[PDB]
Each structure stands twice: as structure tokens, then as C-alpha cells.
Amino acid sequence: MEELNIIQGALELRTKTVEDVMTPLRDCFMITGEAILDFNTMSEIMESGYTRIPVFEGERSNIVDLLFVKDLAFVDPDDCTPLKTITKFYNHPLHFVFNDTKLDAMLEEFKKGKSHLAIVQRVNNEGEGDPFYEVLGIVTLEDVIEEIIKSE
Amino acid sequence: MEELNIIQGALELRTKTVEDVMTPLRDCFMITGEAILDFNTMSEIMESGYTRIPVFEGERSNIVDLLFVKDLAFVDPDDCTPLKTITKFYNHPLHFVFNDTKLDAMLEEFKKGKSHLAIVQRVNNEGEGDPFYEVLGIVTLEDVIEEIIKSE
Numbered sequence: 207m208e209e210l211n212i213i214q215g216a217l218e219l220r221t222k223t224v225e226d227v228m229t230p231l232r233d234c235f236m237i238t239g240e241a242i243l244d245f246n247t248m249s250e251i252m253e254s255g256y257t258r259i260p261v262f263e264g265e266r267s268n269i270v271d272l273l274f275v276k277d278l279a280f281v282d283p284d285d286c287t288p289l290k291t292i293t294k295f296y297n298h299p300l301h302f303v304f305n306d307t308k309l310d311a312m313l314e315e316f317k318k319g320k321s322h323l324a325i326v327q328r329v330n331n332e333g334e335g336d337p338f339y340e341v342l343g344i345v346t347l348e349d350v351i352e353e354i355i356k357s358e
Numbered sequence: 359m360e361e362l363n364i365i366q367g368a369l370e371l372r373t374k375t376v377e378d379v380m381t382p383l384r385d386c387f388m389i390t391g392e393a394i395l396d397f398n399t400m401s402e403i404m405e406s407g408y409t410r411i412p413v414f415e416g417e418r419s420n421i422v423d424l425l426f427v428k429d430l431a432f433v434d435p436d437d438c439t440p441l442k443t444i445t446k447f448y449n450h451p452l453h454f455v456f457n458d459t460k461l462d463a464m465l466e467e468f469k470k471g472k473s474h475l476a477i478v479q480r481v482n483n484e485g486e487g488d489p490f491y492e493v494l495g496i497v498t499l500e501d502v503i504e505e506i507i508k509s510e
């Protein structure tokens with residue numbers, strides 16, 4: 207039954223964390239902030255199929271912004287507009303989350319806000335002296351939902 | 359509690375039908391097949407935030423195609439390409455579903471396919487002689503998901 211798998215997933219929201227279902231950084235379709243929204247760039251982004259594209263600068267672990275396909279609506283390819291212009295203008299808020307975060311809580315924060323995408327990062331206390339925040343990947347509402355509705 | 363909301367939705371997956379959670383035709387963002395994809399049309403489609411756009415011809419009930427935002431990737435607004443060109447090119451399959459269809463069966467049909475959008479239609483028996491199919495609206499995976507996870 208579908209109901210059994212759904213209920214089981216709901217139960218498992220208590221146990222599992224965001225790291226269990228996240229899309230790790232190496233599997234994330236991202237883009238540099240130094241990009242130029244000419245026709246080719248826009249077509250790449252659009253055929254990627256992803257609604258939300260994390261924007262990094264320098265290194266992929268350095269997520270500095272978040273691009274929506276929706277933002278490309280009024281963008282003319284002929285103008286060759288720098289992406290920095292769009293990310294500065296819209297300035298969609300970035301949402302972060304620790305790796306040990308349980309799925310029920312993540313579902314709660316997703317529900318409560320307009321947020322659908324959080325950035326999974328880990329507290330790197332295994333120094334190398336002083337610690338820092340280490341971006342592991344991304345987690346979306348669809349991940350949680352799929353963990354709910356998947357068969358098992 | 360969230361677990362209980364989810365379990366309850368699971369319990370309601372067989373009681374409720376797709377008609378109960380569909381987005382009715384009058385609330386659907388749609389587009390004519392006679393449309394030309396100039397800059398204004400593409401910007402209007404992109405601005406709407408909808409990934410999948412029902413393509414109607416004649417009346418809005420006559421859903422003949424399904425447009426994907428993804429299908430606008432390689433389209434240049436300067437060409438003023440007929441939308442018919444793109445719909446004929448990709449030809450995304452149309453999925454129809456009867457209004458009395460339960461949410462569990464709908465969910466099962468969604469999972470075992472790439473399809474995420476069905477057209478909710480019923481059988482208008484008040485003849486007027488020969489019966490026919492009347493398009494009521496659209497239903498997506500997101501709809502049944504929202505049914506599952508929402509509070510009650």
C-alpha cells in the first residue's frame with residue numbers, strides 16, 4: 207500500500223537527518239557569480255531543468271547567492287547582462303541548515319517559510335586548529351517529500 | 359504534530375478524489391496554440407512561475423498541448439517562433455484523468471511515470487443525447503503532496 211510507505215516515511219522523519227537525503231555539492235547544478243546572462247548561459251540554465259540554481263563565487267563551497275529561472279523572465283539575451291545585476295536586484299534570501307538536522311524540523315521550516323531550498327553545511331570541528339562552516343550540499347522540500355512517499 | 363498530519367493525509371488518500379484537490383480550469387495559467395513566442399510572450403510565461411503550462415486552442419477547455427518552461431531554452435525571442443513549432447517539436451504526452459479518481463491511484467500513476475500533471479475531466483451525462491468528456495481542471499503531484507502534509 208501507498209499509505210504504509212507514507213506512514214513509514216512520516217515515522218522516519220524523526221530518525222533521519224538532512225544529510226541522508228541531500229543532494230551533495232558534486233551533484234549540484236550551480237553557476238558562478240561572474241557569469242554573463244548572454245543567450246548561451248540562459249539556455250544552459252533553462253535546459254538544466256532546475257528551478258533554483260545556487261550561485262557560487264570562486265569555489266563551489268562558497269555559495270553566495272541563489273538564482274531562480276523566474277528571474278530570467280525580463281532578461282534580454284542581447285543585453286549580455288551580468289548575473290551580479292540580477293542577483294543584486296532580486297536578492298533572494300539564502301537559507302542554511304546543519305547536517306544533523308532531523309527531517310521533521312526541516313519540513314517544519316520549509317512549511318513555515320516561503321523557503322524550498324536550504325544549504326546543508328557541517329561544523330568542521332575536526333581541525334586544523336580553529337573550526338569553520340563547511341557546505342556539504344543542498345536539501346529541498348522535494349527531498350523530504352520523496353523520503354515520505356517513496357516505497358520501501 | 360506533523361507525523362499525525364501526514365498519517366491523516368495518508369488515511370485520506372483513498373477517500374478524497376482528484377476533483378477535491380484539482381486546480382480548476384478558471385484558476386489555471388494557460389496559453390493559446392496560436393501564440394507567438396516573442397520576448398513579451400516568453401517573459402509572460404517565465405514570469406508566471408509555472409513549470410508546466412496547458413496549451414489550449416479554441417476554448418480553454420480544449421487542452422491540446424502541454425508546454426514546458428524547459429522547452430523555451432533554445433528559443434530566441436528575436437525569431438518570433440510560433441508556439442506550434444515547439445509543441446509539435448517536443449510533443450509532450452498529455453495525461454487525462456477522471457474526476458472520481460482517488461488520490462492513492464493518482465499518486466501511484468504519478469510515481470510510475472515521468473508525468474507530474476494530469477487533466478481532470480468528467481462525463482457530462484445531462485444530454486442532449488450523446489455523452490462527452492468535460493475538462494474540469496488540472497491535478498499535479500504537488501496537489502496530492504499538499505493534501506498529505508497540510509495541517510488539519
Ligand SMILES: Nc1ncnc2c1ncn2[C@@H]1O[C@H](COP(=O)(O)OP(=O)(O)OP(=O)(O)O)[C@@H](O)[C@H]1O
Pocket residue numbers: 228229233234235236255256257258259260322344345346347348349409
Ligand atoms: N541546482 C540544483 N542542482 C542539482 N540538484 C538540484 C538543484 N536544485 C534542486 N535539486 C534537486 O532536485 C531534487 C528535487 O528538487 P525540486 O523538485 O525542489 O527541484 P525543482 O524541480 O527545480 O523544483 P520544483 O519541484 O519546484 O520544480 C532534490 O533532490 C534536489 O536536491
Ligand SMILES: Nc1ncnc2c1ncn2[C@@H]1O[C@H](COP(=O)(O)OP(=O)(O)OP(=O)(O)O)[C@@H](O)[C@H]1O
Pocket residue numbers: 257380381385386387388407408409410411412474496497498499500501
Ligand atoms: N499552469 C498552471 N496554472 C495554474 N496552476 C498550476 C499550473 N501548474 C500547476 N499548478 C498548480 O500549482 C500547484 C503546485 O503545482 P506544481 O508545483 O507541480 O507546479 P510548478 O511549481 O510549476 O511545478 P514544479 O513544482 O515541478 O516546478 C498545484 O496545486 C497545481 O494545481
Ligand SMILES: [Mg+2]
Pocket residue numbers: 348
Ligand atoms: Mg521538481
Ligand SMILES: [Mg+2]
Pocket residue numbers: 500
Ligand atoms: Mg511547484
